[PDB]
Every structure is written in C-alpha cells, then in structure tokens.
Amino acid sequence: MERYENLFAQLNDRREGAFVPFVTLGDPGIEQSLKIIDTLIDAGADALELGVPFSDPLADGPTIQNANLRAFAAGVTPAQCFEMLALIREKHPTIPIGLLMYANLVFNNGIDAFYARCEQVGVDSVLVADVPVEESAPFRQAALRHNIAPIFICPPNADDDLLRQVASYGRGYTYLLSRSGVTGAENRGALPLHHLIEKLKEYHAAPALQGFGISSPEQVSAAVRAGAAGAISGSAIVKIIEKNLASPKQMLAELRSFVSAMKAASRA
C-alpha cells in the first residue's frame, strides 16, 4: 500500500500522472521476463501490474490470453512467479508492485497465506479480476492484514452506492475501467469518466488509474486531463513481446521506446 501513497504524493509534486504497464510474469520465459520488467522500469514505469499465469483468465482478451499461454509453455508456476516477485522487489525499493490475480490462485492454498506470501516478497497491491465487491470481504481483509492494498474496479457506469463501496474498501489506487468487455488494445474506451473521477475524489477514494484499451500517448494524457492519477497499459506492451519473440534485442528496444513515450505523455 504505502509505496502507492508515496508515489502519488511524489507525482503530485512532479506534476505528473503515473504510467503503469502490465505484463504476465514469466512471458516468454522467467529470465526474459525479468529483463523485460527491468526495462519497463528503466524506461520510466511508475509502477507495475504483474499477472500470474492462470489457466482461465476470463477478463482478458486474446493478447493476454496468449501471454498466459506462452508462460505456461515455459512451465511457469505461481511458485516461480513469487520467486520472481521477491527478486524484483530486491532490486527496486520504492516502485509499487501490483498483482493481477484470478480468485482460484488466491484461494487455492488459503486466502490468508496468499496475502502473507505477498507481504513477504514485497508486493504492494492485489487485484482479483473475478471477485466483485459483493464477494470481496475475505480478500480485502486478508490484504489489509498483510499490508497489501486491495484494488477495486470502478466500472464506467458505477452507481453511487458502488462508488462509495469502492472508495471505502479500496487502498493503493482505484481501478477506473475504460469500458465494458475484456482487456485489449483493439478496443478503445469511448465513455467520459470525469464524473466518476470527481465522485471518487469526493469520497476520498484511492487515486484512480484508468485501464483497459490504453495503447497510445494521447490516451495517457487524456486520463490525466480528466482528473485521473494515471493510466495502465497491458495489451499494447504485451503485443511488443509477442511481436519480438525471435529477437530479445529488438524486443527490449521497442519496449523501452514505447514505455518512454507513454511516460512522457503523463506530464501535466
């Protein structure tokens, strides 16, 4: 949690939004994934969203489905992912690390133990994609007990009650969904979110990051202009991985370029 508070405070001072890439851990292998993540950071990522490969990623479009599949083809397991996360935090003191989980991987060996492991390795937040606020109780309790921010989704059509729930229960950042559907750069969000962003601030919600379908610098700037604290980009990053599987050199170069450009767009 507190890594986010410090980041948001600092960005506030730097007059900048946060740019936050997503990748699947272990895609396309453990070693290449670690180098990918280091590159994201070096190129200007303000925080990370990291997916643990799961057999049933039902909020993800094909780009991320395929990322899940590539990690599985390299034999990547949650245990290996947690080793990766320990190493990532061992290298980088302050950057907020958030996991993108599905429920069964959290519940599998006990919800409390899951969040305890997260705390041990230095994770800052967890978003469980198939747990709605209605089911969130044991997840958010476990998270807070272990100093993990539980990340809640605010859909573009959220009603007042849902805004108040997300505002009260959330920590770290509030996930502002661009649109309905599943992750994917091929679908840009087309709903204005400034009313949600204002109401979340009124209710003292954690700062909002816009996510889903963000693939270009103009969208980062738009999110900041609408009042959001920053933006998350997943599919567009993962597409660069997919594109460059045959050339780790070109892969990192293109990741660096893309993240650099996207982070630059976050300057107010």
Binding site: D56, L58, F107, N108, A129, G181
Partner: protein
C-alpha cells in the same frame, strides 16, 4: 445485493468481474418476475408440451430386474425433443432472454448437446445464436457442429487455454462482458454464478415433479431412491428438486469414475476433487495442486465440465444427497445391458446412473427397493465410441 441467496451453504456465489454484476442482477430480477407471471408460465408450458413433447414417459424395466426385489423405472428424458433433458431449460432461458428484451443468445458447449439445444431453442424463437466451442471439441464433434449450423447458429472455435469446454465457458463470459445489454448467456448446467444454479434447477424441476406423479400413479408411494448422472448437475437437480423435502426418498448422484478414482483420470470432483473458485462459483473442482483448472475425464464426452453445481455440494454436505462414482467399464456394461434387454439405447452419461442402479440391485438382490433412474439422454451419439471399444477389445 440480490433478491435470492446466491449461496447453498458455503457453496456458490457470484465470482464474476464487476462489469458482469449488473447482468447477473438483471437476470435474477427477470427470473423472479417470470416465476410469478402466469403468462410466462403458460408460454413455457406450451413449448414444453407441444414443441418438446412433455410429459416424458416413465418406463418400467422388467427384463433387467427379473428375479430380484428391485423394481426399476426409467424417466425417459431421452424422448424429449433433441434427445436429452437439456431442451427443458434452454426453452425457459430463451423465454427469459425475450422477457429482458434480448434477441441474441450466447452458449458454450463441449460435446455439443448444449449447443444443439441452444440452437434449436433459438431457431424456434427467432433469436440469433452464437455458440463457443473448444477447437478440440469442434474437431471431435463434427455431427453436433453441423446440427448447430443447420439450425442457423454460429459456431465459434475457441483456441485459448486447453481449447476445450472450460475455455468455451470463458469465451462465452468474455463476450457477455461486452454484449450483455443485447445478448443473454444461456449457460448449460446447474452451475456458474448465481442465479444460474437456481434458474437451471427450476427450469428442469418438471423431471422430478412428473416422476413423482407418475410413480404415485403406478406404485401408490414414493420411490426409495432417484438416481442421476452428475456432470455440472442439471439433470440430477431436475430429478431431485421435487423430492428434497420428501426425506424418505434417497437422492443419489453418480459422477464418472473414468479409469478409476485411484488413477486420477476421472470426472468426480464432488467426492474426489478439491473446492476452489472458478466459472463464477465456489465449488469442488478438478484442479492441479497449484490451482490450475484440470480435465474432467470420462468415456462419456458429455462429462467434461471440470466442476459441479453448488447445490449438489451443499446437499452432499448436509447428507441429504449421496454421491457415488461409476467407472468407464461399468458404464459400458450398463449401456450394453439396456440395449439388449430393454431395446433402449442410453446416453453413456445416463449409463453411469443405470450402472449404479444395477449395482444396487445386484449387490443386494433380495432387498425390496423401488428405484428411478433419470435416463437424461439417448445414446445414438455414442454407438461409434462403443463400437470402437468393443472391437479393440476383441469383443
């Protein structure tokens, strides 16, 4: 906030992305409203009778029980239009879609029967039907794929994950996550997020209601047990529902034992899996040690759903229903028995239920017992599988 309890004890819930909660809430509202609407009920009854052929026969099987104190009846859902009980609930769900103003249907299918049921309901009622099917299933189930296409449905192969039923299920939900204002997700078993386990039960409960009336008429008393094969749980909960409060009536659910429980190659998560969260519910599932969803294996392709409906896990927990397993070989023997001695070719799924009834009888042939087996489907679709087993066997 819901109208109905999303849980059966510890099992069930609504584990879907936040974006889908209004879809579930809408569908629950619509169902509750429909169940009170005499016009909706009349439309449903009209389709069940004049289109699907309800009520279905209750057939007394004399040859196979001769010389024992077992009396065995088969509830003949194999005679329903489409050749399986799945038809009952697709007609109900198609009406619910119409009630909500939707003109499009999404369905998943593994072995194909739910896709076919979804397609036929959609064709009758003028709905645009799209059906997700694992690419490995599409390749394996050409006949059912063609039936669905003949009935005007779009069949969409799914290449993600394991390219089988669970992956189809995911795709259907991904689509619904963007399309739910215009499209209804016609889920194919008594499982998934609330309200589907409740809805599918209520739209199958006529199986047990009719069974009750038929057995009272023929025998003057309730059955000692009703027995059904348990994939996700729809045909079984359809048979059980009306007897739950009749505490003298045994409710026996039969999961596929596959090559044998001890081999791990089976489809019996209720008794031999582990509880997890998937496809919107907390339920026993087939899963790896580290929580990845696994295969549900049976000689019967229709027992591919890797979990089980939450009401079954609940009824088990409180001891109201008992769950057992039957292996591939046992199911095969039951299939051959019914063909030869009663002239009915049963679904291999339903063969699991029959095999358990036959075991109840044979183990204790002097025990007086009145049993109903839910023959949920006909077995024409299975004759090639069986042929190949018998040939490879030197039989």
């Amino acid at each position: 906030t819901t109208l109905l309890n999303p849980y059966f004890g510890e099992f069930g819930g609504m584990y879907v992305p936040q974006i889908l909660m209004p879809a579930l809430n809408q569908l629950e509202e619509a169902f509750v409203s429909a169940q009170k609407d005499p016009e909706f009920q009349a439309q449903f009854a009209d389709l069940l009778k004049n289109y699907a052929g309800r009520p279905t026969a209750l057939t007394k099987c004399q040859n196979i029980t001769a010389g024992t104190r077992t009396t065995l009846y088969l509830k003949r859902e194999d005679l329903l239009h489409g050749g399986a009980h799945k038809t009952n609930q697709v007609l109900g769900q198609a009406l619910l879609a119409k009630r909500m103003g939707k003109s499009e249907i999404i369905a998943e299918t593994g072995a194909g029967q739910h896709g076919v049921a979804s397609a036929l309901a959609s064709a009758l009622l003028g709905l645009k039907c799209r059906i997700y099917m694992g690419a490995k299933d599409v390749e394996r189930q050409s006949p059912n794929v063609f039936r669905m296409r003949l009935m005007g449905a779009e069949v969409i192969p799914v290449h993600s994950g394991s390219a089988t039923l669970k992956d189809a299920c995911n795709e259907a939900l991904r689509d619904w996550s963007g399309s739910y204002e215009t499209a209804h997700y016609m889920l194919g078993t008594a499982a998934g997020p609330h309200p589907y386990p409740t809805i599918v039960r209520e739209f199958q409960r006529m199986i047990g209601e009719e069974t009750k009336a038929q057995i009272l008429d023929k025998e003057g008393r309730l059955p000692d047990a009703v027995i059904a094969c348990v994939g996700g749980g729809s045909n079984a909960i359809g048979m059980f529902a009306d007897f739950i409060n009749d505490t003298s009536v045994g409710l026996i659910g039969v999961e596929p034992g596959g090559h044998g429980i001890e081999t791990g190659e089976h489809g019996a998560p209720l008794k031999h899996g582990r509880v997890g969260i998937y496809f919107g519910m907390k339920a026993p599932m087939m899963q790896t040690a580290d929580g990845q969803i696994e295969e549900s294996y049976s000689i019967s392709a229709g027992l591919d759903f890797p979990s089980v409906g939450p009401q079954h896990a609940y009824l088990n927990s409180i001891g109201r229903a008992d769950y057992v397993s039957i292996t591939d070989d046992e199911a095969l023997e039951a299939f051959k028995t019914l063909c030869r001695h009663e002239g009915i070719i049963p679904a291999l799924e339903s063969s699991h239920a029959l095999a358990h009834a036959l075991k109840m009888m044979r183990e204790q042939p002097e025990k007086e017992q009145l049993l109903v087996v839910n023959l949920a489907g006909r077995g024409d679709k299975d004759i090639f599988t069986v042929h190949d087993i018998l040939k490879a066997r030197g039989e």
